[PDB]
Amino acid sequence: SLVVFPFKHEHPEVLLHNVRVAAAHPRVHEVLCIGYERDQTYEAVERAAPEISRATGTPVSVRLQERLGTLRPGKGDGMNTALRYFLEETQWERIHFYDADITSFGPDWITKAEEAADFGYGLVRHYFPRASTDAMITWMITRTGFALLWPHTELSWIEQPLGGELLMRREVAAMLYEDERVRRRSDWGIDTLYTFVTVQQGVSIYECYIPEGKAHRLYGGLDDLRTMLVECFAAIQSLQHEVVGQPAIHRQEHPHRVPVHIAERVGYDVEATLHRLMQHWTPRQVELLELFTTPVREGLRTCQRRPAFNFMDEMAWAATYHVLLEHFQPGDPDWEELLFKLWTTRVLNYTMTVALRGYDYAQQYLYRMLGRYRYQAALE
Amino acid sequence: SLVVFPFKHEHPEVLLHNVRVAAAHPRVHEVLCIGYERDQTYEAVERAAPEISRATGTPVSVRLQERLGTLRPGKGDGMNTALRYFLEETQWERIHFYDADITSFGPDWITKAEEAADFGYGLVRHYFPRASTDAMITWMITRTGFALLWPHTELSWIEQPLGGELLMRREVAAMLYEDERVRRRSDWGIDTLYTFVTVQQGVSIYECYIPEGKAHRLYGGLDDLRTMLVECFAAIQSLQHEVVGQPAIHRQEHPHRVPVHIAERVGYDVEATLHRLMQHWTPRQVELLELFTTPVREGLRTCQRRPAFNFMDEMAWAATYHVLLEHFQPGDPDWEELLFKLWTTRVLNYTMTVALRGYDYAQQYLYRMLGRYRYQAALE
C-alpha cells in the first residue's frame, strides 16, 4: 500500500517519526510526503527520507503539491496530488492518508485500516473522540448541512467527514481523482468532497475507532478556524442541488469510553471569541441581516454593542443555515464575516446550554440534534 | 392501523392500560389481543373491550391463539394468528406488535413507528437500552449465529432480532404469513424467523430507539430462559444452509444515553446459575461432550463437581457454536441440557471477564465481539 502524509509547516521530527512507523509496517510498500512548499519542514523531510528508505527497505519520497484545483491552494491540492501520483506512477492497490502532526501514531492504525479493507470496504475512515467544544465545524456546519439537505441518506451519519485519516482502495481513488468537483476543491473543502462523493457513489465505508492521536490546535478564539469555516461551508453550498440515493453500506466500530483528557478539554478561548464577535462590523453586514429571521437579525445586530448568543438556539441555527445556503457569496468579505459571526453565536449558545452540562450530556445532545434536523428536513 | 398485544395470564391491569393507550391513539383503527386460553385475564379484556371501544371509537377484540405451526405452541402461533386476522379480517395498511407486559408503553411508541412507515419503510423495529447481563440469548445465540454464518449480510447488524415490538406494512405481513418456515415456527423462534426472512427478502428496515426501556423478568437463574434458549438456537440451526444476499436499506436511530437504572441493573441470579450448572447431568451428556474441543469437553465435565467457566471465552464459544450447529438435536433432552449448560458457562465467563468491568466496557466488547466473529467467518 501507499501511505501519504500531506504536510505544510508541522514540526518535522513528529512527521519523520510517523513516516518511520509507516515505512516499517509490513503492509506498506511506499511512503509519500506531499509538501505545501519548499520550507524548513520540507528540506528536513527531503534530507531524512533516504536514511528511512535504507533502514526499512521501504521507499520514502517527498514531492511538492501540484496546482490541480481552482480555489485557495491548500489541503485539496495536496491530497489530489497524492491521488495523481498513486494512480499514474504506482501500481499499489490501496492508499492511506494521515495528518503529519498526529501524536499517537502506531502500526495498529495502519493494520486496522488494512484489515477492514481486507473485509471488502472501499473506504475506511479513522475517527477519534473529541472535546465537547472541538469539532464545531464538523457538527454545526458539515454534519448539520448533510442532515438538513439529505436527511434520508448516509451523509450525516459519517462521524468525522472532515477527517484526514483514511484508506481508499484504488478504484475509489480513481473515481475521486476523475471527478471535477473533487479536483477543483484545492482548499479545506476537499474532505467534504471526498466524503460526499464516496457516499453519493455508493462506496462501502467502515469507520475505525482510534482513542487518541489528533493534535490539538493552539489555544485561541474561533477566529483561528475562520478560513476552514468559510471553505467548508462553501463546499456544502456548492453541493446543495445534488441528488443522493439512500443505498449505503456504512459501519462504525463501537467507541471505547472517552479518555479523561479529552472529556476535560476546552477547545477555544471564550473571552477572545466574545470580543471578536463585536469586531469588524460594516454597514453592509448590518443590512444583509435583513435576509434572516427577526430573532437572528436583531440578535446579531446586538453584537455591535455587546456579545449576544442566547437567540441562536438549535432551530434558529437551521433557519439561519438555509438563508446562508441561498444568499452566501463565497469570497465576499461581508458574507464570510457574517457566516463567521453567526456560527460564533451558535457555538457560544451550544457551549453555555449544552457543553457546560458536561461531556456525556453534550455527546447525547449532538446526535439527537442531527436526528431532529433530519426529521424536520424530511417533513418540509 | 391494527395494534396487537399477545398476552399471557400476567398482570391484566397492565394489558388493559396498554390497550387503552393504543385505542386512544389517533392513527390506531383497531386493537387485537391474542391469548392461549380463556383464563381470567382473557375474560377481563373481553369484558372491558366494549367500554374501551365506545369511549375511543376504536374496536377492541380478543381472540384465541390458533395452532398454525408444528413446534411447541408458544409465541409464534400467537403472532401468526394475529397476522392471519390482519390479512383475512381487516384492510388496514399496517400492523403493530407490542408485548402486553410492557410498563412504559406510551403513544409516542406508536407515533414513531407510524411516521417511519410514512417514509416507506416496510418494517419498523423498536429497540431499547438493556442491562449488560440481559439479552444473553440475543448476543450469544442470535447475533452471534448471524455473524458466524452470514458475516457480509445485514442480519447481525439488526440490534434486537428477538424484539417483539415492531410495525409491518401489509405487504411484509403477507409475505411472512405465506412463508412456510415462518408459519411453522410456533414457539419462541418466531422473532428470529421474522427478522431473518425480512432481511433475506430485502425489506427496508428502520430501527427506532425507545430511550426509557421496557420490562424486566423476575429475578432468577438463567434456567428461567432455558426454553427460549433452546428454541432460539434451533431457529438459527434450521436456517444455517440458507443463502442471504447483500444489505438492503437499513436506517438505525442513534442510541440515546443509557438510563442509570439500566446500566446498574443485574439481569440474573449468579448463585442460582452456578448451582444449576451442577444439576441434571446424565452419562449421555458426558458422552456428547466428545464432539467438542478438548478445553470445552474438560471444562464442562468439571461442572459435575464444581462450577467452571473460565474456559468458555469468545473463541471457545465460536467453536462450540459450530459443533452445536452440526450436532444439536432439538427435542432431545440431553442435547437441550448440554446447550443450556454450555450457554450458561459462556454467560458466566462474559459476566466475570467483561460485565464486571462496567457497562461501557461491556457495550464495546459485545459490538466488537460481533465484528471479530464476522471478520473471522469471512476469512476462513
Next chain:
Amino acid sequence: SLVVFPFKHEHPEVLLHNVRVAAAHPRVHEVLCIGYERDQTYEAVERAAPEISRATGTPVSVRLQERLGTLRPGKGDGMNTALRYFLEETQWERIHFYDADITSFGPDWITKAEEAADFGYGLVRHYFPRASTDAMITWMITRTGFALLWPHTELSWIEQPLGGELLMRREVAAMLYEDERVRRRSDWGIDTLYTFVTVQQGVSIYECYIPEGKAHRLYGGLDDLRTMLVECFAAIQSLQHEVVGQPAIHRQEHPHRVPVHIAERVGYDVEATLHRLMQHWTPRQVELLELFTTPVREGLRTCQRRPAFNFMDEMAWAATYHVLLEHFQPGDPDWEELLFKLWTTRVLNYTMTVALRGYDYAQQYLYRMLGRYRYQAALE
C-alpha cells in the same frame, strides 16, 4: 423540638406543605413561621394553623420579624427573632431552621438532625449537592475568606457556611442570641455569623448529607445575587481581625453520588452576566481600581468596553480579596458595584476554565483551591 420556617414571597402552598411535614413528625413539639409583614402568605398560614394544630397535636404559630439588628432588615432579623421566641417563650431543647421554599422537604431531614443531636452534637448542619455554577458566593467569598484568613482552623472546612438548614441545641442558640456580633447581623450575613461564632466557640458540629438536594433560584444573571454577595463579603470583612483557635469536634457524613440533574445544571445566565458587567460604571469605580494589582485594574477597566475575565484567575482573586478586605466600604454604592463586577469576573473565569471541563473536574478544583489558599496563607 421547635421547627422554624422563615418565609417571604414564596407561594404559600410550598410553605404550608413543609409546615404539615414538621408538625406531623413525632419529635417536633412546635412549628414557628416568621415573615416580614402581614401579606397574603402570612394570612394563609395564620388561617391554616389551627387546623394543622388540631390534626397533628403540634402547635403552629406565625410571628412577625422583629428589628433586632442594625444592618438591612433581612434574614438575620428573622432568624434572631426565632431564637428569641425559642429561648423566651418555649422550653424545647432543640431548634431547627429550614428555608420555607424547599420543595424536597421530608421527615427524614428532621430525623437525621435529631438523631445526630442525641449523640451530643451542639450544631447539626444539613448540606446538599450543588451544581458547579451554583454556590459561587459560598466558594469564592465565604469559604475562600475563611481559608485565606484562618487556614489552621475548622472554618473553611464547613461545607455550606451559608446554609439555612440546621439544628441547634438550646445552649448553642442561647450563646448565639447573646452575642452582639450575631444580633446585629440582620441581613444575609447571619448564616456566616452563626457558622463563625459556633466554630470560634468550639461547638461540636455534625454535617449531614441530604442527597436529594434543595431549591433552585429563578434563572438569571449573577446580579440576582448582588445584595447577598455584598452582605456576605461584609460579614467576612467584619470578622477579619478575630482570633480563632484550633479545630474542635467536626463529623461530616460522606457525600453520596451527585444526582445527574444537579451535575448537569447551569446555575446562571452567562449572556446576561456578560452584559451586566459592562453596565453601571462610574468614574469613581474606575479610580478605585488604582488600589488593585495591575492585571486586575487593567482587566476590569476593559469591561467598560467589552467583557474581560481571563485575568481573574485563582491567584488574582486572592490578591483582589485582600485589597477588598482592607478598602471595601459596605453601603458605598461604588464599592458595592466594584465588588460585584470583580466577583462576576472570577465566576466567569472559573466557569470557562473549570466548570466547562465537567462536574468532577470542578469539584476537585474547588476543594483543592481552598487547599492552595490555606497553604499559601499559612506560609506567609
Next chain:
Amino acid sequence: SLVVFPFKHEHPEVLLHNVRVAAAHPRVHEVLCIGYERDQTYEAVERAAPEISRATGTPVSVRLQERLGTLRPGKGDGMNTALRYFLEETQWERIHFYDADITSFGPDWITKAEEAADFGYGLVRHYFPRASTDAMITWMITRTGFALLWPHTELSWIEQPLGGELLMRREVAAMLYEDERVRRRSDWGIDTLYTFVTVQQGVSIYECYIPEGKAHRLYGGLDDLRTMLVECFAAIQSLQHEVVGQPAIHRQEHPHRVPVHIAERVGYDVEATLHRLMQHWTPRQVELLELFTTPVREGLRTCQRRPAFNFMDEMAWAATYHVLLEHFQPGDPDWEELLFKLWTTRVLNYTMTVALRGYDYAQQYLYRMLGRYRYQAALE
C-alpha cells in the same frame, strides 16, 4: 528526610529506579532499603547503592530487617527496623515509607508529603483509587471493624488504613516505636497498628491523593490474600477493648476522576474463588458454625456441596464480624479457614450485588456501608 523502601522479592530494577528518584530529590537526605533476607533482590540492591549515592550525593544504605516483634516475621519487622534506624542512628526530622514495587513513583509524591508536613501535619498518608474488587481486606475487615467498634472516632474515616505509603514526623515515629502493641506486630498487621495508634494518640493526619502507582497483585483467587486477611483481622481483634476519644484532625485531598484502567479492573479470579470455598472443610469447621447466626451457619455449610454467598449480605457480615471478634483464635487453622470462607462469601456477595452494577455504584455503596455500620454500632 529519610525515605525507606521495605522490600522482599520485588523486581530489583523497579526498586532501584524508585531509590534513584528518592535520592535525587532535594528534600531527601538519605535512602534506606530494608530487606527481608539476603536474596537476589537484596544483592542487586547492595551492589547498586554505591553508584546511586555517588551520582545523587545522597547516601543510600541497605540493611536486613531485624526480629523486633513476636508474630510472623514480616512487613512489621521491616517497618519497625526502619523506625529504629531513623530514631537511633539519624537526626532526620521526617521519615517516608514507600512500597518497593510502586509503578509510577516520581518526585511529586515526596514533594506532596513534605509540603503537607510543612503545613503542620504529624502523619501524611498517600491514597490511591482502587478497582471495585480490590481492597477487600481494607473495606470488609479493617474499615468495617473500625466502624463497628469505634463508630464515633476518626478510625473508619482513614482511606486505606493498610497503605504503606506515608510520611511521619520524628515524634510520631518515636511514639510508635516505643509502643509495645506496635513493636510486637511483626506481620501484615503493622499498618493497622500504625493507623490505630496514631489516631488514638490524636496525631493530625493528612491524606494526599495519588491517581496511580499501586502495583496490582498477580491474577488469582482470594486465597492469595489469606495470610494478610487472617493477620489483619487478628490485629483488629487484638485492639477491640481499647478506648479511643473523638478529637481528631484528619483531612483528605479531594480525588480526581478514577482512571479508566482502574475502573475497568477486576481484582480476583471468581471461578478459583468459588472453587476454593468448597475446599479444606473439616468436621470442626462445620461444628464451629454453631456459634454464628442461623442464615450464616446454614449458608456456609452449603459450601461443602456448592458455592453459596447470597446469604452474606451487609447485615449478615456485621453479625458475623462480632461472632469472629469474640471466638476467633489466631493461629488456629480451623478458625483461620472459617474467617477466610466467611470473608470470601462476603466478597462474592458484594461482587455480584454491588461491583457488577459498576464502579460509581460501588464507590458510593462502600462509603454508605460504613455509614450504616457506624450508625448501627452507635445505637447498640
